[PDB]
Design an enzyme around this catalytic site. Structure first.
Site, PDB file in Angstrom:
ATOM      1  N   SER A 190       0.944  -1.564   0.754  1.00  0.00           N
ATOM      2  CA  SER A 190       0.513   0.093   0.035  1.00  0.00           C
ATOM      3  C   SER A 190       0.544   1.435  -0.127  1.00  0.00           C
ATOM      4  O   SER A 190       0.291   1.701  -0.490  1.00  0.00           O
ATOM      5  CB  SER A 190      -1.115  -0.220   1.499  1.00  0.00           C
ATOM      6  OG  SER A 190      -2.824  -0.354   1.107  1.00  0.00           O
ATOM      7  N   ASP A 215      -0.222   0.360   7.812  1.00  0.00           N
ATOM      8  CA  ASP A 215       1.253   0.011   7.696  1.00  0.00           C
ATOM      9  C   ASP A 215       1.939   0.379   6.580  1.00  0.00           C
ATOM     10  O   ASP A 215       1.296   0.123   5.218  1.00  0.00           O
ATOM     11  CB  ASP A 215       0.727  -1.743   7.992  1.00  0.00           C
ATOM     12  CG  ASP A 215       0.636  -2.273   9.287  1.00  0.00           C
ATOM     13  OD1 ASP A 215       0.162  -2.908   9.302  1.00  0.00           O
ATOM     14  OD2 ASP A 215       0.105  -1.303  10.225  1.00  0.00           O
ATOM     15  N   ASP A 220       4.547  -1.647   5.039  1.00  0.00           N
ATOM     16  CA  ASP A 220       5.847  -2.580   4.233  1.00  0.00           C
ATOM     17  C   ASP A 220       6.685  -2.565   3.985  1.00  0.00           C
ATOM     18  O   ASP A 220       6.945  -1.809   3.204  1.00  0.00           O
ATOM     19  CB  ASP A 220       4.881  -3.404   3.644  1.00  0.00           C
ATOM     20  CG  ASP A 220       3.795  -3.961   4.370  1.00  0.00           C
ATOM     21  OD1 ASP A 220       2.164  -4.305   3.775  1.00  0.00           O
ATOM     22  OD2 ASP A 220       2.819  -4.558   5.761  1.00  0.00           O
ATOM     23  N   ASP A 251       5.998  -2.684   9.699  1.00  0.00           N
ATOM     24  CA  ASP A 251       5.962  -3.628   9.302  1.00  0.00           C
ATOM     25  C   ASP A 251       7.712  -4.795   9.107  1.00  0.00           C
ATOM     26  O   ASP A 251       7.329  -4.320   7.575  1.00  0.00           O
ATOM     27  CB  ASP A 251       5.139  -4.919   9.111  1.00  0.00           C
ATOM     28  CG  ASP A 251       3.740  -4.895  10.061  1.00  0.00           C
ATOM     29  OD1 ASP A 251       3.565  -4.326  10.569  1.00  0.00           O
ATOM     30  OD2 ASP A 251       2.789  -5.041   9.263  1.00  0.00           O
ATOM     31  N   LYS A 256     -10.339  -0.549  -3.620  1.00  0.00           N
ATOM     32  CA  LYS A 256      -9.459  -1.393  -1.948  1.00  0.00           C
ATOM     33  C   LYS A 256     -11.005  -1.310  -0.861  1.00  0.00           C
ATOM     34  O   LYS A 256     -11.991  -1.450  -0.561  1.00  0.00           O
ATOM     35  CB  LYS A 256      -8.832  -0.942  -1.523  1.00  0.00           C
ATOM     36  CG  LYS A 256      -7.486  -1.541  -2.015  1.00  0.00           C
ATOM     37  CD  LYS A 256      -6.306  -0.477  -1.247  1.00  0.00           C
ATOM     38  CE  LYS A 256      -5.810  -0.786  -0.560  1.00  0.00           C
ATOM     39  NZ  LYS A 256      -4.847  -2.051  -0.210  1.00  0.00           N
ATOM     40  N   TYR A 260     -12.390  -8.887  -0.207  1.00  0.00           N
ATOM     41  CA  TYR A 260     -11.253  -8.700   0.157  1.00  0.00           C
ATOM     42  C   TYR A 260     -10.342  -9.392   1.026  1.00  0.00           C
ATOM     43  O   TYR A 260     -10.768  -8.627   2.009  1.00  0.00           O
ATOM     44  CB  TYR A 260     -10.755  -7.271   0.156  1.00  0.00           C
ATOM     45  CG  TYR A 260      -9.203  -6.436   0.166  1.00  0.00           C
ATOM     46  CD1 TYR A 260      -9.328  -5.605  -0.652  1.00  0.00           C
ATOM     47  CD2 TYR A 260      -8.245  -6.999   1.133  1.00  0.00           C
ATOM     48  CE1 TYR A 260      -7.666  -5.031  -0.474  1.00  0.00           C
ATOM     49  CE2 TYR A 260      -7.506  -6.815   1.284  1.00  0.00           C
ATOM     50  CZ  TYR A 260      -6.773  -5.293   0.441  1.00  0.00           C
ATOM     51  OH  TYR A 260      -5.387  -5.045   0.723  1.00  0.00           O
TER      52      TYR A 260
END
Length: 523
Positions: free
Chosen positions: A86, A97, A99, A151, A212, A221
């Site tokens: 994202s 978050d 990534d 993350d 989304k 999703y």
């Protein structure tokens, strides 16, 4: 020319005044749904990522110094962080978050990451929380930092240095890697390629933001349950943009629904010619692998080696995805006729209203928060298998899995009360019997706790012969015996249990409804 995809465009005609009009209301609806964070929050993210890059270099610097190396060499050793998902695509929202991938030279182990780098993190005043998962399938440290969620995973390259200017386009970087490092490196290679295969990235971003929200709302999703994940949706939006290089995002959306609803599944969706390279390799080819010929709505990652992101899709989920494409077609056509608005596209699904019958899947644990994650996480990962066994039966029109588990916990306390839970939970006719046990809300004075993870499957039946009616209890016991064999401790009825309940829509537990709704019963 690659940004126009493997067939070139369907059309190069740019947006008209009237089409741009709808795009502006599309953006405005996304703003009201809270799709965009503030520009500061983005400045804050960039700031936190600049700090992590310095930590990665320290991390690497220190490890190298312990591995005997000179200052010149330790500094040369490098270390670099990338983002994917994202945030890298630029479609992140408030609270999403980042990534993040930490790439390291060969002399730097995972033990190093879970010790030296973990220590470097804690020494920061900005570190709000840290949760290492060293035992993880995908090895990770999950942190919250200056308020921002990150993350961090680590990939280890077979090379002496990781210079500041390194990019991961080169498939030579993958030879000699083991499975974990291949997996860790893949996420970024894919995101970068997606971005280089769309003709107008801003158009792409807005379209994606829309899909989304729409996907979450319509409960389509959720990779684990046989629906497309975020990457799958991303590539799907990416394909339609290749087809209309000069369209505004609102058109991309309309077109997206028509093209995908009418697509010749299982013809794969592909963003660039699939390539092959070093070794027998895990490349997607239905001419070779049976596993690959059985993919139902295949959507193929562009970065070598190409893989199918939508492996989990079933007959039943295929049917749901398409129903929603069609709904997507109608409503959008109406928007363009001014008959409907963007809000209508984004209405919440009515999953707990649309079926006469629901099948109820509860993972029970007598133990700690560790034990429940492990136990429920497994059962959950197996729901699609029960769907595939259900959906192919004669009597079943559809077996539709909901996309979010329902979780709850009680102080038990004694082993008498645990069996009562696995008696009275899950029916509304007898449900409040559990009110004789303390439930966990917020907040503490707590010790011996029973844990509950419930998943739902909506059921729909074909008219049956009165002499030849459908029985589901065989694949159900098949399913429990499937789960009670994945580590021996799961046979312990004293602690782990698995209840399947067939329950009518009016008999559904209250937990399942919003602070908006209710379900008048049949009689």
């Amino acid at each position: 020319q690659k940004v126009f995809g493997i067939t070139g465009p369907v059309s190069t005609v740019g947006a008209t005044a009237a089409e741009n009009k709808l795009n502006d209301s599309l953006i405005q609806e996304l703003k009201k749904e809270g799709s965009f964070e503030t520009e500061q929050e983005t400045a804050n993210r960039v700031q936190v990522l600049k700090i992590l890059q310095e930590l990665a270099q320290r991390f690497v610097y220190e490890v190298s110094k312990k591995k005997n190396m000179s200052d010149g060499m330790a500094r040369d050793a490098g270390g670099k962080i990338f983002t994917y998902g994202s945030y890298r695509l630029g479609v992140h929202g408030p609270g999403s978050d980042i990534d993040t991938l930490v790439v390291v030279p060969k002399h730097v182990t995972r033990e190093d990451f879970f010790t030296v780098f973990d220590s470097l993190l804690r020494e920061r005043k900005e570190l709000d929380e840290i949760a290492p998962v060293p035992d993880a399938f995908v090895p990770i440290i999950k942190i919250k930092f200056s308020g921002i969620s990150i993350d961090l995973i680590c990939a280890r390259l077979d090379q002496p240095q990781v210079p500041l200017s390194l990019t991961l386009s080169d498939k030579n970087l993958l030879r000699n890697l083991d499975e974990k490092d291949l997996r860790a490196l893949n996420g970024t290679r894919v995101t970068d390629e997606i971005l280089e295969l769309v003709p107008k990235p801003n158009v792409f971003r807005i379209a994606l933001r829309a899909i989304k929200l729409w996907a979450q709302r319509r409960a389509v999703y959720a990779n684990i349950f046989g629906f497309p994940g975020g990457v799958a949706w991303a590539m799907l939006v990416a394909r339609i943009c290749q087809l209309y290089p000069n369209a505004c995002s609102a058109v991309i959306l309309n077109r997206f629904f028509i093209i995908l609803s009418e697509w010749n599944w299982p013809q794969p969706v592909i963003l660039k010619p699939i390539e092959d390279g070093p070794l027998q390799v895990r490349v997607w080819n239905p001419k070779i692998y049976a596993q690959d010929r059985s993919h139902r709505m295949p959507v193929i990652t562009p970065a070598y080696p190409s893989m199918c992101a939508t492996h989990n899709i079933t007959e039943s989920t295929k049917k749901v995805i398409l129903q929603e494409f069609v709904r997507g077609v109608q409503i959008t056509n109406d928007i363009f006729s001014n008959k409907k608005s963007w809000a209508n596209l984004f209405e919440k699904n009515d999953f707990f209203f649309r079926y006469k019958f629901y099948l109820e899947i509860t993972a029970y644990t007598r133990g700690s928060d560790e034990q429940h994650l492990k136990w429920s996480g497994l059962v959950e990962s197996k729901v699609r298998l029960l769907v595939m066994k259900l959906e192919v039966l004669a009597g079943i029109k559809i077996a539709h899995p909901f996309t979010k588990p329902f979780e709850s916990s009680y102080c038990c306390p004694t082993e008498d009360d645990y069996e009562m839970i696995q008696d009275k939970y899950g029916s509304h006719k007898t449900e409040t019997a559990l009110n004789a046990l303390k439930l966990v809300t917020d907040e503490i004075k707590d010790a011996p706790k029973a844990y509950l993870s419930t998943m739902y499957i909506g059921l729909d039946f074909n008219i049956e012969n009165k002499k030849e009616k459908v029985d589901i209890h065989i694949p159900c016991t098949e399913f429990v015996n499937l789960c009670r064999s994945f580590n021996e401790d799961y046979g312990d009825h004293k602690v782990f249990n698995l209840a399947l309940r067939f329950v009518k829509g009016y008999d559904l537990p209250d937990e399942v409804f919003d602070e908006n709704e209710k379900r008048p019963s049949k009689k």
